[PDB]
Every structure is written in C-alpha cells, then in structure tokens.
Design a protein around this ligand. Sequence first.
Ligand SMILES: CCCCCCCCCCCCCCCC(=O)O
Length: 110
Amino acid sequence: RYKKPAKMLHEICIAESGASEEQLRTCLDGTVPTAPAAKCYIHCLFDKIDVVDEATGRILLDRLLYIIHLTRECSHIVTPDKCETAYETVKCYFNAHDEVIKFCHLLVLE
Ligand SMILES: CCCCCCCCCCCCCCCC(=O)O
C-alpha cells in the first residue's frame, strides 16, 4: 500500500540476515548500512522482490524502480559475495542522502 509490503519485507529480511534494528537504523541519516548482516539484509530485499538477475546476479535496478543516466553501470555490478553485490549497487546508485532516507523510512519505520 506500499508501507504494508515493505514492513513485511523488513521483518522477513531481518530474520534471514540476522541484522539488528540498530544496524539497519543507521539509514535514518542517509548512510547506507555497512554491517555484514545489514549488507545481507539488502540482498534479501532484492531477492524477495525478484530484482536479482538469474543469469549473472546483477541487480535489475530498472525493475526495482518500477516497484519503487547511472542505472546501467550500477545494475552491472557483480562481486563474489551476494551481500557485497547488493551493498555496492545501493552505494553506486543511491549516492544522494534523501534517496536513501526515503527507502529507509519505507522499510524501517511504523
Ligand atoms: C536499511 C534501508 C536501506 C536500504 C534500502 C535502499 C535500497 C533498496 C530498497 C528496497 C525497496 C523495497 C520496497 C519494495 C517492496 C514493494 O514493492 O512492495
């Protein structure tokens, strides 16, 4: 609605990743969370919304934006670790403060 599906994504992904609320809560000032469990929380989000490329593991950023210049390079990031791939993609694309806080608010708060 879209607060209801995001709240559920957050609960499922906190469980799967083992990321604490405090670790994720760092997003409130616009900083992309850096804790290994928090990086895995981000991958879990992409996996649950089905925005992870089956072929390569690239993050399908344009597909994410359907769900709500720089998209193509950031959507072609592949690392040996799925959590690092998710973290590097967000860092690349959501490089502005307000961009991060908006998704943070959607996932993290009431
Ligand atoms: C801890 C928050 C920071 C990470 C959030 C920024 C990058 C990805 C955001 C995922 C959006 C999930 C909302 C889509 C779910 C839906 O469509 O219902």
